[PDB]
RNA sequence: UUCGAUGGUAGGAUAGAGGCCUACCAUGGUUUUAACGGGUAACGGGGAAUUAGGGUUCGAUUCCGGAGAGGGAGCCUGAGAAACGGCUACCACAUCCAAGGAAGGCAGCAGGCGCGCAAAUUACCCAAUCCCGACACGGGGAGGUAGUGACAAGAAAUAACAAUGCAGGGUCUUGUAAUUGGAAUGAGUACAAUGUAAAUACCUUAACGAGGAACAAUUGGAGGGCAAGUCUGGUGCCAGCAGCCGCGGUAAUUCCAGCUCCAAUAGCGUAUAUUAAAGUUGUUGCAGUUAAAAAGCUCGUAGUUGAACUUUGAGCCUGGUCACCGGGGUCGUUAACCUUCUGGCAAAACCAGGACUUUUACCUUGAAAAAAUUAGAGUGUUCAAAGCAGGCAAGUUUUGCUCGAAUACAUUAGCAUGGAAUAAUAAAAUAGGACGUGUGGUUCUAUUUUGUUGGUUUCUAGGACCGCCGUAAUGAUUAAUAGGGAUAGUCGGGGGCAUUCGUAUUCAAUUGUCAGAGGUGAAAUUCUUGGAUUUAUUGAAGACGAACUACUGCGAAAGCAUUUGCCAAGGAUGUUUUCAUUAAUCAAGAACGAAAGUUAGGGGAUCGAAGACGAUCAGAUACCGUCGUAGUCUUAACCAUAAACUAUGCCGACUAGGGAUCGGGCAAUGUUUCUCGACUUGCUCGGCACCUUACGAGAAAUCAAAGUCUUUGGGUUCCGGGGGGAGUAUGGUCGCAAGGCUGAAACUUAAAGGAAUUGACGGAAGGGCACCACAAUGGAGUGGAGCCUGCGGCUUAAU
RNA sequence: AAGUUGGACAAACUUGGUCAUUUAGAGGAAGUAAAAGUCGUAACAAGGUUUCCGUAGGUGAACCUGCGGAAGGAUCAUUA
RNA sequence: GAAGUCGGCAAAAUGGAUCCGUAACUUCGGGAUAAGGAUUGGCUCUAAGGGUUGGACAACCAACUUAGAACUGGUACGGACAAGGGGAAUCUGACUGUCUAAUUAAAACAUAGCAUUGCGAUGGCCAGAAAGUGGUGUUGACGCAAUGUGAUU
């Protein structure tokens, strides 16, 4: 049984990027996936993506523009405080300037840098770079 | 994956994107309800009647026209069976296997199949008890399984 | 593989505790072998009473007489073996000399080609070693 | 759970709550989220050690709390003790003794014996801190001061100033100097002044105060790891080293002596316990096809994990630091702070204020909370370990002034504020719902007045409740390439029962015939002129389903192959069929579980454990041939394992090219057949597989999974931590038993093990080549008799 | 006041049983470090009877044989 | 306190009931009343457990038990009577049962279990002098007849 659709979406994206394909199809769709895709698209790692709206959970077609080395999920979603962001960045991110950690804080789903600016922690969703 | 098998079949039905009755199908949303009530008065299965309206009557998915499910329509009209359809069918199959087992004493494969059916019927009964579709005290009985099916 | 649930701490802790006994280091440290089965009681050094001297044969590929000594511990009375570092001092170390023993380095394993030796003489008769070989200090009268 | 374990009633006792105790009444309370029992080589914490992060070990010890004064027990005084530098009784110690007796407790400060690897003076003082008391004054082995130690920490003395032939270098500059002179001299010796209760030490300080024994700095190593010897004498696989490899059988760089150098330096080394190494305990972060390890398979409970969706989009301004960002909100689309109570306003709600989480986890922040410790702010103990002090002012030496003594670490757990992303339970389905200046009523309280007190009525302010009353849009998320249940054509060597057929094997009768038949590489045993073997007819027995039988099918696995009938069931496919999360994984717990083995009954043809004979080699005792026991068959009860294999757990998603193959479905104005079937082609779903490739993985063999893993996290069970000992002993448990499940320790070893490569070997195969190989009717011979010559045995003195 | 009758606290002593540890104990059955000898492939090649697993019997010794399995075999192969 | 004796022969000791507790071994059924401990009288009470019956109840009549408490005396009480001694091993027979009336009660016999033999009736076994004779046999191999061994493993 599908335990987390976000893991499947990110695994499909990274698999397509390794294969070199410029488009990828993700099934099913969810608000968490849409928020995650918005975060990486705002950061510039993801081109336009269209949500096919059938009478089901939905499907997403994403245009991949390269410049992604690895995108993954952190399961289980550990609760991350303000002081734990540095530890997570050191553990996951390649450096202090490259890579993004996505946290579902109280103010919504956003990057670790934006959450640090918000001065609010939350739960770790995943990472991409 | 299959609940009690190694198969991975995906055969199902793909409901159309449209949610409206066909142009010529002027089912008027009340003659169908009367037909469903008549088909339930005899005591046919809700799935079986829905098949009959799909094939013989030519009616589309009944929800798209009547606005309510087959189970919901008959429950609203009062023709609600004492037990759910899947619950009753599994008890029927379990009763038949036990009646075959009491005659054929050397069928270990049938005994194993009966054990699988007993596991399935208990899990379904537990779900229905939790959801409240049945009285809280609905302990399944092996000796009175004939009572439960009929 | 291993469970990765947010509430799987009990399962992870129980598995780690159960499997921790497989390691020899943890098993030794928690079974108290350094006190019960060991000739000492975790002591770094101890005193003993000499019993005799043995020229234990050397295993392959060597063959030698290592002039080791059989000693009886003062605190327990058990009989163990000891090694003499300096050369030709067998005449110097006699029996019932109130010898002082310490370990060898492998924390309870035989050294080199001589099986059954884990302790070496540090001091003998209270005069110590490294002096009776250079004739810096002589043995006292007994 | 008695003789109190759970709760209730009543009582006693306690300063007070209380099964603390008593009498009665019910049987209760904890527990796989580990109750109970056992070990602790266990006082707990602040804290200490190691230090990427995470973690691991320790805490007897300067502070806080607990217990104790040899072991318990009892009690007086006293606010406060079950006090022991108070007492009483008993036990184990030791003690003076006129043998009648008294009697004692250093785990308090010094000191003594013993156990010990291991730890100091029977010193001085109440001067500083504080404590007690009747008290400005007394006492304090608390505490301070000193004395001995090898170590716990912080700072530096063993020196440097020149001439010196030469190696030189470049007239500039180091070197040993069998050499000297002048320089800077600091520890000590000793009266001073400070210091101190008095002293020790410290800073200043009468003066004396180094030329080589100066006033000699050592500990380990020099094959590698890890730094530094094919330098010289002695032994010679011995003595011995040697943490490991390894060296030592006359050239010893590793043994012991001289010399030199190397790392550290008043320190070096050794032993043990721990940490890093160890990504060899793996949450971060291991591994399970072959190196250690996927349970024989399936069901399934605690536990873990759990498809998508419910206020979102756009337009604003606003005060603010880096044209962005954080934040505050209506305006309204779409309803504007849901709601409870109150103030004024009054045609309720409209405005504002108090509470607003149903209930959270989660995040932020705040309150509250020992110091010491750590990080760290400031400050010149001459620096530093330190300490919490300090600073002005260099012309009057100033009847004073000026800073500080921060800050963080806190959240484990508890209280509180703000947010509602993520993840959880309910909202109104038999409407058993917000319904409300509400159509009618009950019932109570007086928060009040009717005269202060007591009582009924009820106007009144309020809690609660009884049949209705349509205020309104009255109420059910899609139905997951999740799942279950139907339904149609099927499909299957899937299961059970009954039933049909087949020849083969053996045996029995009779018939034709006579010499051998069987068997092996060769035999041998046995039977056969009494009719062997063979052949012809009939009958019986049990076993088994050849050929078709396939890199084909079914079943959860073990396994399933003659026909037919019945019963129950199963996957896949088709489906605008039904319910709607009903799901995955499993500790425990149960079903099935080859063959062999067990208990009995029936049955027992062939084969065949054990066994019986005959070659076989030296011995065969085993392979071989014949016979032949248990067994192989079935029925009813057992067990519970195998190379039970795909040496590869289950569920979900993604990942490349081809052709075969089974089941289903879709299409063919394609072929064929007396309405459908057979063949062919294309598409799709679900299986068994095959070939190529390796983006990718691995140690490689290899792998479409063993890939998507240092770029390490989808969910979940089982299992391993070098090899032996050993799946052994013991313990528990299932079985009538064999045995099954669970399952160590001591001791020992420096290696076992996997993959692959090169040689070697094979009573392995395939190509060949050879009179030192054979075939050839081979020719000649040696060896057979006797002699030359040489080799061992013998003799001698040397032979 | 000594003494005395009852109640509880009850130290401590006798008799027995249970638990943990230790010391015994002749002797019996194991492996490891092992004086010469002993010993044939049981296994490493087709190890000379292919190997191995489960089960049962027999044998001084590895072991032999019966039944069912696996290749970890010495065969990935017979479409005619 | 068995030193007696071949030998605990004989005797003594235990003994009922209630409440605790009970090992090795085992065929799981036992051993077991294992072993080992405590109490028991009289009197006065307390509590609980059942029947019909006059208007939540009820004054009777007709009833027996159990458990507990205080007090008391010869620290005694199944006060006579009644009434198990127990344990650790070896040989042997499995057990219940049977026999030498009048010296041997046993390890002897029998037993269930196990195994063998004959017989399909024109027969097996037995009987009778014979018989137109009898038994097994009102029987038919799950039967009858004849033997050996002696539970289970």
PDB file of N, CA, C and O (backbone and C1' of nucleotides) in Angstrom, chain F residues 48-78:
ATOM      1  P     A F  48     -26.472 -11.422  59.287  1.00  0.00           P
ATOM      2  O5'   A F  48     -26.195 -12.555  58.203  1.00  0.00           O
ATOM      3  C5'   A F  48     -25.298 -12.327  57.127  1.00  0.00           C
ATOM      4  C4'   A F  48     -24.879 -13.617  56.469  1.00  0.00           C
ATOM      5  C3'   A F  48     -26.005 -14.541  56.034  1.00  0.00           C
ATOM      6  O3'   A F  48     -26.588 -14.156  54.800  1.00  0.00           O
ATOM      7  C1'   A F  48     -24.362 -15.791  57.181  1.00  0.00           C
ATOM      8  P     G F  49     -28.133 -14.476  54.494  1.00  0.00           P
ATOM      9  O5'   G F  49     -28.122 -15.999  54.029  1.00  0.00           O
ATOM     10  C5'   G F  49     -27.275 -16.429  52.975  1.00  0.00           C
ATOM     11  C4'   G F  49     -27.083 -17.925  52.992  1.00  0.00           C
ATOM     12  C3'   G F  49     -28.353 -18.757  52.942  1.00  0.00           C
ATOM     13  O3'   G F  49     -28.854 -18.898  51.624  1.00  0.00           O
ATOM     14  C1'   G F  49     -26.909 -19.602  54.619  1.00  0.00           C
ATOM     15  P     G F  50     -30.318 -18.357  51.248  1.00  0.00           P
ATOM     16  O5'   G F  50     -31.296 -19.387  51.964  1.00  0.00           O
ATOM     17  C5'   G F  50     -32.686 -19.387  51.682  1.00  0.00           C
ATOM     18  C4'   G F  50     -33.303 -20.726  51.990  1.00  0.00           C
ATOM     19  C3'   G F  50     -34.819 -20.749  52.086  1.00  0.00           C
ATOM     20  O3'   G F  50     -35.449 -20.838  50.821  1.00  0.00           O
ATOM     21  C1'   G F  50     -33.903 -21.850  53.958  1.00  0.00           C
ATOM     22  P     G F  51     -36.935 -20.265  50.621  1.00  0.00           P
ATOM     23  O5'   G F  51     -37.873 -21.499  50.982  1.00  0.00           O
ATOM     24  C5'   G F  51     -39.265 -21.317  51.181  1.00  0.00           C
ATOM     25  C4'   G F  51     -39.858 -22.435  51.999  1.00  0.00           C
ATOM     26  C3'   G F  51     -41.209 -22.144  52.634  1.00  0.00           C
ATOM     27  O3'   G F  51     -42.288 -22.351  51.739  1.00  0.00           O
ATOM     28  C1'   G F  51     -39.762 -23.110  54.242  1.00  0.00           C
ATOM     29  P     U F  52     -42.822 -21.154  50.811  1.00  0.00           P
ATOM     30  O5'   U F  52     -44.360 -21.503  50.592  1.00  0.00           O
ATOM     31  C5'   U F  52     -45.376 -20.707  51.183  1.00  0.00           C
ATOM     32  C4'   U F  52     -46.021 -21.406  52.353  1.00  0.00           C
ATOM     33  C3'   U F  52     -47.036 -20.584  53.134  1.00  0.00           C
ATOM     34  O3'   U F  52     -48.322 -20.619  52.540  1.00  0.00           O
ATOM     35  C1'   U F  52     -45.555 -21.696  54.631  1.00  0.00           C
ATOM     36  P     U F  53     -49.209 -19.285  52.414  1.00  0.00           P
ATOM     37  O5'   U F  53     -49.167 -18.645  53.872  1.00  0.00           O
ATOM     38  C5'   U F  53     -49.920 -19.200  54.948  1.00  0.00           C
ATOM     39  C4'   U F  53     -49.697 -18.434  56.228  1.00  0.00           C
ATOM     40  C3'   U F  53     -50.186 -16.988  56.208  1.00  0.00           C
ATOM     41  O3'   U F  53     -50.617 -16.610  57.515  1.00  0.00           O
ATOM     42  C1'   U F  53     -47.846 -17.024  56.553  1.00  0.00           C
ATOM     43  P     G F  54     -52.122 -16.098  57.751  1.00  0.00           P
ATOM     44  O5'   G F  54     -51.991 -14.509  57.782  1.00  0.00           O
ATOM     45  C5'   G F  54     -52.842 -13.687  56.996  1.00  0.00           C
ATOM     46  C4'   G F  54     -52.944 -12.293  57.564  1.00  0.00           C
ATOM     47  C3'   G F  54     -53.177 -11.176  56.557  1.00  0.00           C
ATOM     48  O3'   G F  54     -54.541 -11.036  56.192  1.00  0.00           O
ATOM     49  C1'   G F  54     -51.432 -10.562  58.031  1.00  0.00           C
ATOM     50  P     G F  55     -54.988  -9.915  55.130  1.00  0.00           P
ATOM     51  O5'   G F  55     -55.193  -8.603  56.011  1.00  0.00           O
ATOM     52  C5'   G F  55     -55.323  -7.328  55.399  1.00  0.00           C
ATOM     53  C4'   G F  55     -54.495  -6.287  56.110  1.00  0.00           C
ATOM     54  C3'   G F  55     -54.024  -5.119  55.256  1.00  0.00           C
ATOM     55  O3'   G F  55     -55.008  -4.110  55.107  1.00  0.00           O
ATOM     56  C1'   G F  55     -52.197  -5.981  56.475  1.00  0.00           C
ATOM     57  P     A F  56     -37.819  -0.990  47.359  1.00  0.00           P
ATOM     58  O5'   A F  56     -38.948  -1.948  47.949  1.00  0.00           O
ATOM     59  C5'   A F  56     -38.720  -2.709  49.126  1.00  0.00           C
ATOM     60  C4'   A F  56     -39.415  -2.098  50.317  1.00  0.00           C
ATOM     61  C3'   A F  56     -39.558  -2.989  51.541  1.00  0.00           C
ATOM     62  O3'   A F  56     -38.377  -3.048  52.323  1.00  0.00           O
ATOM     63  C1'   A F  56     -41.610  -1.877  51.105  1.00  0.00           C
ATOM     64  P     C F  57     -37.963  -4.412  53.068  1.00  0.00           P
ATOM     65  O5'   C F  57     -38.353  -4.151  54.591  1.00  0.00           O
ATOM     66  C5'   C F  57     -39.204  -5.043  55.297  1.00  0.00           C
ATOM     67  C4'   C F  57     -40.642  -4.595  55.224  1.00  0.00           C
ATOM     68  C3'   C F  57     -41.565  -5.106  56.320  1.00  0.00           C
ATOM     69  O3'   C F  57     -41.451  -4.362  57.522  1.00  0.00           O
ATOM     70  C1'   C F  57     -42.606  -5.385  54.218  1.00  0.00           C
ATOM     71  P     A F  58     -42.458  -4.614  58.751  1.00  0.00           P
ATOM     72  O5'   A F  58     -42.857  -6.152  58.636  1.00  0.00           O
ATOM     73  C5'   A F  58     -44.223  -6.554  58.701  1.00  0.00           C
ATOM     74  C4'   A F  58     -44.427  -7.717  59.642  1.00  0.00           C
ATOM     75  C3'   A F  58     -43.155  -8.295  60.259  1.00  0.00           C
ATOM     76  O3'   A F  58     -43.459  -8.798  61.560  1.00  0.00           O
ATOM     77  C1'   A F  58     -44.251  -9.969  59.020  1.00  0.00           C
ATOM     78  P     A F  59     -42.940  -8.034  62.875  1.00  0.00           P
ATOM     79  O5'   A F  59     -42.913  -9.170  63.993  1.00  0.00           O
ATOM     80  C5'   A F  59     -43.457  -8.935  65.284  1.00  0.00           C
ATOM     81  C4'   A F  59     -44.537  -9.933  65.625  1.00  0.00           C
ATOM     82  C3'   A F  59     -44.074 -11.348  65.943  1.00  0.00           C
ATOM     83  O3'   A F  59     -43.612 -11.490  67.277  1.00  0.00           O
ATOM     84  C1'   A F  59     -45.857 -11.443  64.405  1.00  0.00           C
ATOM     85  P     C F  60     -43.282 -12.942  67.886  1.00  0.00           P
ATOM     86  O5'   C F  60     -42.947 -13.840  66.612  1.00  0.00           O
ATOM     87  C5'   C F  60     -42.889 -15.255  66.712  1.00  0.00           C
ATOM     88  C4'   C F  60     -44.213 -15.893  66.371  1.00  0.00           C
ATOM     89  C3'   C F  60     -44.210 -17.410  66.263  1.00  0.00           C
ATOM     90  O3'   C F  60     -44.314 -18.049  67.524  1.00  0.00           O
ATOM     91  C1'   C F  60     -45.339 -16.485  64.398  1.00  0.00           C
ATOM     92  P     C F  61     -43.301 -19.231  67.926  1.00  0.00           P
ATOM     93  O5'   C F  61     -43.744 -20.452  67.005  1.00  0.00           O
ATOM     94  C5'   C F  61     -45.038 -21.026  67.120  1.00  0.00           C
ATOM     95  C4'   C F  61     -45.349 -21.909  65.939  1.00  0.00           C
ATOM     96  C3'   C F  61     -44.293 -22.951  65.600  1.00  0.00           C
ATOM     97  O3'   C F  61     -44.381 -24.118  66.400  1.00  0.00           O
ATOM     98  C1'   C F  61     -44.897 -21.798  63.637  1.00  0.00           C
ATOM     99  P     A F  62     -43.046 -24.796  66.983  1.00  0.00           P
ATOM    100  O5'   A F  62     -42.387 -25.506  65.719  1.00  0.00           O
ATOM    101  C5'   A F  62     -43.032 -26.597  65.079  1.00  0.00           C
ATOM    102  C4'   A F  62     -42.566 -26.753  63.654  1.00  0.00           C
ATOM    103  C3'   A F  62     -41.080 -27.012  63.461  1.00  0.00           C
ATOM    104  O3'   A F  62     -40.703 -28.362  63.674  1.00  0.00           O
ATOM    105  C1'   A F  62     -41.737 -25.278  62.028  1.00  0.00           C
ATOM    106  P     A F  63     -39.166 -28.827  63.536  1.00  0.00           P
ATOM    107  O5'   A F  63     -38.308 -27.672  64.236  1.00  0.00           O
ATOM    108  C5'   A F  63     -37.706 -26.614  63.494  1.00  0.00           C
ATOM    109  C4'   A F  63     -36.543 -27.093  62.664  1.00  0.00           C
ATOM    110  C3'   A F  63     -35.164 -26.963  63.287  1.00  0.00           C
ATOM    111  O3'   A F  63     -34.891 -28.001  64.217  1.00  0.00           O
ATOM    112  C1'   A F  63     -35.108 -26.240  61.026  1.00  0.00           C
ATOM    113  P     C F  64     -33.390 -28.306  64.710  1.00  0.00           P
ATOM    114  O5'   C F  64     -32.800 -29.252  63.572  1.00  0.00           O
ATOM    115  C5'   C F  64     -31.417 -29.567  63.531  1.00  0.00           C
ATOM    116  C4'   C F  64     -30.873 -29.479  62.127  1.00  0.00           C
ATOM    117  C3'   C F  64     -29.380 -29.210  62.022  1.00  0.00           C
ATOM    118  O3'   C F  64     -28.633 -30.414  62.131  1.00  0.00           O
ATOM    119  C1'   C F  64     -30.574 -27.754  60.565  1.00  0.00           C
ATOM    120  P     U F  65     -27.091 -30.499  61.687  1.00  0.00           P
ATOM    121  O5'   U F  65     -26.491 -29.083  62.088  1.00  0.00           O
ATOM    122  C5'   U F  65     -25.116 -28.801  61.891  1.00  0.00           C
ATOM    123  C4'   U F  65     -24.867 -28.215  60.526  1.00  0.00           C
ATOM    124  C3'   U F  65     -23.645 -27.319  60.419  1.00  0.00           C
ATOM    125  O3'   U F  65     -22.456 -28.059  60.206  1.00  0.00           O
ATOM    126  C1'   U F  65     -25.509 -26.224  59.462  1.00  0.00           C
ATOM    127  P     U F  66     -21.177 -27.832  61.149  1.00  0.00           P
ATOM    128  O5'   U F  66     -20.361 -26.690  60.400  1.00  0.00           O
ATOM    129  C5'   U F  66     -20.197 -26.723  58.991  1.00  0.00           C
ATOM    130  C4'   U F  66     -19.961 -25.342  58.438  1.00  0.00           C
ATOM    131  C3'   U F  66     -18.981 -24.483  59.217  1.00  0.00           C
ATOM    132  O3'   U F  66     -17.632 -24.781  58.910  1.00  0.00           O
ATOM    133  C1'   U F  66     -20.914 -23.219  58.708  1.00  0.00           C
ATOM    134  P     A F  67     -16.524 -24.785  60.071  1.00  0.00           P
ATOM    135  O5'   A F  67     -16.146 -23.247  60.238  1.00  0.00           O
ATOM    136  C5'   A F  67     -15.708 -22.486  59.124  1.00  0.00           C
ATOM    137  C4'   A F  67     -15.865 -21.006  59.363  1.00  0.00           C
ATOM    138  C3'   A F  67     -15.342 -20.481  60.687  1.00  0.00           C
ATOM    139  O3'   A F  67     -13.935 -20.318  60.708  1.00  0.00           O
ATOM    140  C1'   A F  67     -17.476 -19.571  60.274  1.00  0.00           C
ATOM    141  P     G F  68     -13.127 -20.516  62.082  1.00  0.00           P
ATOM    142  O5'   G F  68     -13.357 -19.144  62.858  1.00  0.00           O
ATOM    143  C5'   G F  68     -13.031 -17.905  62.248  1.00  0.00           C
ATOM    144  C4'   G F  68     -13.681 -16.744  62.957  1.00  0.00           C
ATOM    145  C3'   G F  68     -13.388 -16.616  64.441  1.00  0.00           C
ATOM    146  O3'   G F  68     -12.121 -16.041  64.707  1.00  0.00           O
ATOM    147  C1'   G F  68     -15.699 -16.317  64.069  1.00  0.00           C
ATOM    148  P     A F  69     -11.331 -16.420  66.054  1.00  0.00           P
ATOM    149  O5'   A F  69     -12.011 -15.502  67.163  1.00  0.00           O
ATOM    150  C5'   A F  69     -12.106 -14.098  66.983  1.00  0.00           C
ATOM    151  C4'   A F  69     -12.984 -13.465  68.030  1.00  0.00           C
ATOM    152  C3'   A F  69     -12.679 -13.843  69.469  1.00  0.00           C
ATOM    153  O3'   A F  69     -11.584 -13.118  70.001  1.00  0.00           O
ATOM    154  C1'   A F  69     -15.014 -13.949  69.095  1.00  0.00           C
ATOM    155  P     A F  70     -10.624 -13.788  71.100  1.00  0.00           P
ATOM    156  O5'   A F  70     -11.364 -13.496  72.479  1.00  0.00           O
ATOM    157  C5'   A F  70     -11.714 -12.170  72.845  1.00  0.00           C
ATOM    158  C4'   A F  70     -12.797 -12.152  73.893  1.00  0.00           C
ATOM    159  C3'   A F  70     -12.504 -12.924  75.168  1.00  0.00           C
ATOM    160  O3'   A F  70     -11.699 -12.190  76.074  1.00  0.00           O
ATOM    161  C1'   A F  70     -14.695 -13.422  74.414  1.00  0.00           C
ATOM    162  P     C F  71     -10.588 -12.936  76.962  1.00  0.00           P
ATOM    163  O5'   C F  71     -11.437 -13.711  78.064  1.00  0.00           O
ATOM    164  C5'   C F  71     -12.329 -13.013  78.921  1.00  0.00           C
ATOM    165  C4'   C F  71     -13.270 -13.958  79.623  1.00  0.00           C
ATOM    166  C3'   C F  71     -12.617 -15.129  80.337  1.00  0.00           C
ATOM    167  O3'   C F  71     -12.112 -14.775  81.612  1.00  0.00           O
ATOM    168  C1'   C F  71     -14.461 -15.898  79.067  1.00  0.00           C
ATOM    169  P     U F  72     -10.733 -15.404  82.139  1.00  0.00           P
ATOM    170  O5'   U F  72     -11.144 -16.863  82.626  1.00  0.00           O
ATOM    171  C5'   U F  72     -12.233 -17.054  83.515  1.00  0.00           C
ATOM    172  C4'   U F  72     -12.724 -18.478  83.481  1.00  0.00           C
ATOM    173  C3'   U F  72     -11.654 -19.545  83.637  1.00  0.00           C
ATOM    174  O3'   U F  72     -11.288 -19.754  84.988  1.00  0.00           O
ATOM    175  C1'   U F  72     -13.063 -20.104  81.825  1.00  0.00           C
ATOM    176  P     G F  73      -9.768 -20.100  85.371  1.00  0.00           P
ATOM    177  O5'   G F  73      -9.747 -21.690  85.406  1.00  0.00           O
ATOM    178  C5'   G F  73     -10.834 -22.414  85.972  1.00  0.00           C
ATOM    179  C4'   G F  73     -10.760 -23.882  85.642  1.00  0.00           C
ATOM    180  C3'   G F  73      -9.431 -24.559  85.991  1.00  0.00           C
ATOM    181  O3'   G F  73      -9.660 -25.888  86.456  1.00  0.00           O
ATOM    182  C1'   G F  73      -9.886 -24.835  83.693  1.00  0.00           C
ATOM    183  P     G F  74      -8.650 -26.550  87.517  1.00  0.00           P
ATOM    184  O5'   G F  74      -7.483 -27.167  86.621  1.00  0.00           O
ATOM    185  C5'   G F  74      -6.197 -27.413  87.176  1.00  0.00           C
ATOM    186  C4'   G F  74      -5.364 -28.322  86.304  1.00  0.00           C
ATOM    187  C3'   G F  74      -4.971 -27.778  84.938  1.00  0.00           C
ATOM    188  O3'   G F  74      -3.853 -26.909  84.992  1.00  0.00           O
ATOM    189  C1'   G F  74      -5.757 -29.999  84.714  1.00  0.00           C
ATOM    190  P     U F  75      -3.688 -25.731  83.910  1.00  0.00           P
ATOM    191  O5'   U F  75      -3.591 -26.492  82.513  1.00  0.00           O
ATOM    192  C5'   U F  75      -2.383 -27.129  82.108  1.00  0.00           C
ATOM    193  C4'   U F  75      -2.343 -27.351  80.616  1.00  0.00           C
ATOM    194  C3'   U F  75      -0.949 -27.592  80.040  1.00  0.00           C
ATOM    195  O3'   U F  75      -0.968 -28.486  78.914  1.00  0.00           O
ATOM    196  C1'   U F  75      -1.868 -25.622  79.099  1.00  0.00           C
ATOM    197  P     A F  76      -2.297 -29.223  78.368  1.00  0.00           P
ATOM    198  O5'   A F  76      -2.853 -30.067  79.601  1.00  0.00           O
ATOM    199  C5'   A F  76      -3.257 -31.419  79.443  1.00  0.00           C
ATOM    200  C4'   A F  76      -4.758 -31.545  79.362  1.00  0.00           C
ATOM    201  C3'   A F  76      -5.346 -31.584  77.960  1.00  0.00           C
ATOM    202  O3'   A F  76      -5.274 -32.868  77.365  1.00  0.00           O
ATOM    203  C1'   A F  76      -6.551 -30.032  79.264  1.00  0.00           C
ATOM    204  P     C F  77      -5.004 -33.013  75.788  1.00  0.00           P
ATOM    205  O5'   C F  77      -6.459 -32.957  75.146  1.00  0.00           O
ATOM    206  C5'   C F  77      -7.431 -33.936  75.477  1.00  0.00           C
ATOM    207  C4'   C F  77      -8.833 -33.427  75.264  1.00  0.00           C
ATOM    208  C3'   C F  77      -9.156 -32.899  73.879  1.00  0.00           C
ATOM    209  O3'   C F  77      -9.396 -33.925  72.934  1.00  0.00           O
ATOM    210  C1'   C F  77     -10.037 -31.437  75.524  1.00  0.00           C
ATOM    211  P     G F  78      -8.495 -34.017  71.608  1.00  0.00           P
ATOM    212  O5'   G F  78      -9.368 -34.896  70.611  1.00  0.00           O
ATOM    213  C5'   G F  78     -10.689 -34.511  70.265  1.00  0.00           C
ATOM    214  C4'   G F  78     -11.482 -35.687  69.760  1.00  0.00           C
ATOM    215  C3'   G F  78     -11.609 -36.857  70.723  1.00  0.00           C
ATOM    216  O3'   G F  78     -12.659 -36.670  71.656  1.00  0.00           O
ATOM    217  C1'   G F  78     -10.959 -37.651  68.589  1.00  0.00           C
TER     218        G F  78
END
